[PDB]
Structure formats: structure tokens, C-alpha cells
Amino acid sequence: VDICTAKPRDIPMNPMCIYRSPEKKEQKIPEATNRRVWELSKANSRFATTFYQHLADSKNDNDNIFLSPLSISTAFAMTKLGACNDTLQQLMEVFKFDTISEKTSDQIHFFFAKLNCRLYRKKSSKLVSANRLFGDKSLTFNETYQDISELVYGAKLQPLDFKENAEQSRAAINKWVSNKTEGRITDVIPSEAINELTVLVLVNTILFKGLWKSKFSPENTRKELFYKADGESCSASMMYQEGKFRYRRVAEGTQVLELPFKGDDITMVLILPKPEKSLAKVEKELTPEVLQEWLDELEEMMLVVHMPRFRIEDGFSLKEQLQDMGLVDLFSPEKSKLPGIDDLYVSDAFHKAFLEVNEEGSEAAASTAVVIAGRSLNPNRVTFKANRPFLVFIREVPLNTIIFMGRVANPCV
């Protein structure tokens, strides 16, 4: 009985410890696409967009960004497995799982079961989950929890010594993650983050590696000025190439470009607004249904792509924002209530996201040059030149899931 065969009966949860979300007062549903995976992903996306807009304000327009809502959601989802009462009512409400009409907190875990099966299930374009919870090596760690936090989210409890080993912990951890993420994510937990008062700490991240299905050519990269959020400009390494790429021009000339990865199931979506418009307006106006709609109308088209190479690493302390967003009873010592594992609450949540884009894709560079003989394209054709701030997305199409999302507001070095 594994993740890909689980039926609701294989994912039980303590009664008198359940939530019932309200009825939603239509359905782009494509071909053979499991509706439950579809519904869940819409909620993950609702959270992905919301969380992102709040994280945008708390940052400068010139700051880059990059996280993994899929990460954070599957994380706090794992934790939520043992939530209950007013604590749980908040995990649902805040991660929009409560927006999947009528669906009960116990079902949510069966959906993730379904999504997770299809998500991380293996040539190229590998996706890996690095989520795990950390609490003191003390009291009850209800086995039933783990037994499932193994089947569904694939990673057990894991108690540490927040006392005699409060330091070789914030290293036992950083060592774990940085191992799974094949060395990409290193300093998972910041400095002076773990001590004795540290009760529980949540750590989440993802590892995506893949090649552009239509690689750019090194021989074509050329330094170019990138106009930033302020007014200035700088030296960025602009990549160049042409070919069929799903595209679409939308509201007030904002460009939406899809570059796929080998496999086609994992793609990168760029959202570049016209020069006169600010990424700000776009970021704020970007709602789950607007974004969802935009992607729905992408048509294959021949065009000229100009996109800068860029690297982006980022660390987060989910706690403050999460709180500010409504999630609190989990971060409070007296208000907590996780009967799945007393006074046990979350001391902090840390996330690290990493993305480096070159002429080949995500994986290590190379020199693969491109030779296209016998091709003549229309002189009048679309042109997508990203020499100004744009959004980024790495989604899994068939599962309509936003894996990573970010903002490249300064690619230069």
C-alpha cells in the first residue's frame, strides 16, 4: 500500500479533530486530469498568489524574490495532519485548503496523496521534496501521525536536542536539507535560530533540475542594459533565440511567455509588463483567476526571445508573515494544540529557494551551440525582450501546479 494506491481509508485522522469548510456559493477541467488534483492545486495556487503579494509589499521593488509555495503548502500541510480545533481551523483557512468546497481536513491529505504521487514520480526534469518538521527529543510523537506523515508527505517527525545540542541541531538540520537538495540549498536555518527555547521548527524546500526543451545558444548571449525598478540601469547577460513558444499578449500589453523544459510537463512562465507599466501594478492586480485565465489562452507562436541569465537564492522566516496573514494559534505556546504529537507549538518556519537560469536551463551550463539551417521567419513577428523586471513561475502543467514563483527585478551582477 503506497502513495499511488492510497484510498481515503488509508489516510485516517482523529475525529473531534476535523474541520468542515463551507460550500462555495466554473470548471476549466481538461482531459484525463484527476479532479481532486485539480481542486487542490487551485487552492495551493490561491495561497501561492496571496502569500506572494504580501511578501512583495514587505520588500523593495528592486529586490529579487523566489520561493516555492508548493513547498510551504506541503510543509504546513504535513504539520496540519496533527492539528486540531482552533489551531486547525486556521491552517485550513490560511492555506486556502478550506476553499475546496465542503471537503474536510481529512480529505485534503488524500488529495496531497494523489498530487504527491504524480508530482515526484520520476530521465530529465527531476523534482525532489525536502520537507521535514523538527521538535525536541522529548514527549509523545504519536506514531499514527508519522506512519502517515510518511505515506503522504514522505518524511518522519525527527526529534532533536534543543538544550545540550541546540547548536549541533541547527547543523543536523542544515546538513540534512543541503544533502537532499544535491547541495543547492545550504544554510537552511539561519544563524542564532536554534537554542533551548526552540520547541518546534519547520523546514521546507524543493529541488528542480531540467533542460530547456529549446536551448538558447551561448554564441548568442550579449551584455545588455536592464532597466530597474528605480530609474537606473545595469549590465546583464541577455540570452537570445527564436522559435515556437506558447505566448499571449494580455491586459495593457503585458507579455506572457512559456519556455518549456525537456518533457514539457514542467515549464517556466515569464510575465513581463509593458515599459510604461510597473511590475507593481501587475503584481497587485495578479489574482489566482486572472493568472489562471492568462495561461489558458496561450497559443503556440513564432517569436524572438530576449531573456537575461540570472541566479536567485532566498531565505525566509515564514512565521511573522504567516501570522500577519491569520495563522497564529500554531505559533503561540499557550494557544497551540497539536494532539498529533505538553505546551507544544512552532518556534519558527524556515524556507530556502534556489534558481539559476542559463542557456541550457537549470542544470549546469555547457557550450551546446545551435545551428538552424533552412529557416526564414516573418519579418513582422512578435518580440519578447525582458530587459526590465518580470515575474517567474515554474509550473507542472498536467497537475496545474505552481511549483516555484519569483521576481527577477535585478539580474545583473
Ligand X SMILES: *[C@@H]1O[C@H](CO)[C@@H](O)[C@H](O)[C@H]1NC(C)=O
Ligand Y SMILES: *[C@H]1O[C@H](CO)[C@@H](O[C@@H]2O[C@H](CO)[C@@H](O)[C@H](O)[C@H]2NC(C)=O)[C@H](O)[C@H]1NC(C)=O
CB of 155 to a second copy, least distance (A): 37
Nearer to a second copy, 244 or 335 (CB): 244
Which of 55, 173, 272, 403 binds a second copy (CB under 8 A)? It is 272
DSSP class of residue 136 equals E
Selection from ligand Y, ligand X, a second copy, none that 301 binds (CB < 5 to 8 A by kind) is a second copy
Choose the stretch contacting ligand Y; rule: CB under 6 A; options: 20-28, 141-149, 217-225, 322-330. 141-149
Judged by CB under 6 A, does residue 85 bind ligand Y? Answer: no
93 by DSSP, 3-state: which?
A: helix
Judged by CB under 6 A, does residue 143 bind ligand Y? Answer: yes
Judged by CB under 6 A, does residue 144 bind ligand Y? Answer: yes
Choose the stretch contacting a second copy; rule: CB under 8 A; options: 77-85, 132-140, 187-195, 365-373. 365-373
Rounded CA gap, 152 and 351, in Å?
20
Spell out the residues 6+ positions from residue 142 whose beta carbon is closer than 8 angstroms to its own: 82, 339, 340, 341
In one-letter notation, the amino acid at residue 63 is D
Task: Tell me the three cell numbers of residue 356.
Answer: 539559476
Other beta carbons within 10 angstroms of residue 291's beta carbon come to 20
Helix (H) or strand (E) run with residue 317 in it? strand 310-317
Rounded CA gap, 121 and 209, in Å?
14
Task: Tell me the three cell numbers of residue 130.
Answer: 525536502
Task: Tell me the three cell numbers of residue 193.
Answer: 535560530
Judged by CB under 6 A, does residue 58 bind ligand Y? Answer: no
In one-letter notation, the amino acid at residue 374 is G
CB of 394 to a second copy, least distance (A): 15
Other beta carbons within 10 angstroms of residue 143's beta carbon come to 10
Within 337-356, which residues bind ligand X (CB under 6 A)?
340
Choose the stretch contacting ligand X; rule: CB under 6 A; options: 15-23, 26-34, 163-171, 394-402. 15-23
Rounded CA gap, 170 and 318, in Å?
17
Binding mask 219-248 for a second copy (x = CB under 8 A): x----xxxxx----x--x-x---x-x--x-
CB of 265 to a second copy, least distance (A): 18
Binding residues for heparin: 38, 118, 132
Nearer to a second copy, 158 or 237 (CB): 237
Task: Tell me the three cell numbers of residue 322.
Answer: 504567516
Task: Tell me the three cell numbers of residue 149.
Answer: 506523515
In one-letter notation, the amino acid at residue 186 is T
Rounded CA gap, 129 and 75, in Å?
10
Judged by CB under 6 A, does residue 138 bind ligand Y? Answer: no
Rounded CA gap, 148 and 65, in Å?
33
CB of 329 to ligand X, least distance (A): 11
Binding residues: 38, 118, 132
**Partners of residue 223 on adjacent β-strands:** 237
Other beta carbons within 10 angstroms of residue 64's beta carbon come to 20
Nearer to ligand Y, 142 or 217 (CB): 142
Which of 142, 221, 237, 292 binds ligand Y (CB under 6 A)? It is 142
Selection from ligand X, ligand Y, a second copy, none that 378 binds (CB < 5 to 8 A by kind) is a second copy
Asked if 352 and 188 count as a contact pair (C-beta separation under 8 A), the reply is: yes
CB of 212 to ligand X, least distance (A): 25
Which residues sit at the interface with ligand X, rule CB under 6 A?
15-17, 84-85, 142-145, 176, 179, 340
Which residues sit at the interface with a second copy, rule CB under 8 A?
215, 217, 219, 224-228, 233, 236, 238, 242, 244, 247, 249, 255, 257, 270, 272, 301-308, 310, 366-379, 386-388, 390, 408, 411
Which residues sit at the interface with ligand Y, rule CB under 6 A?
140, 142-144
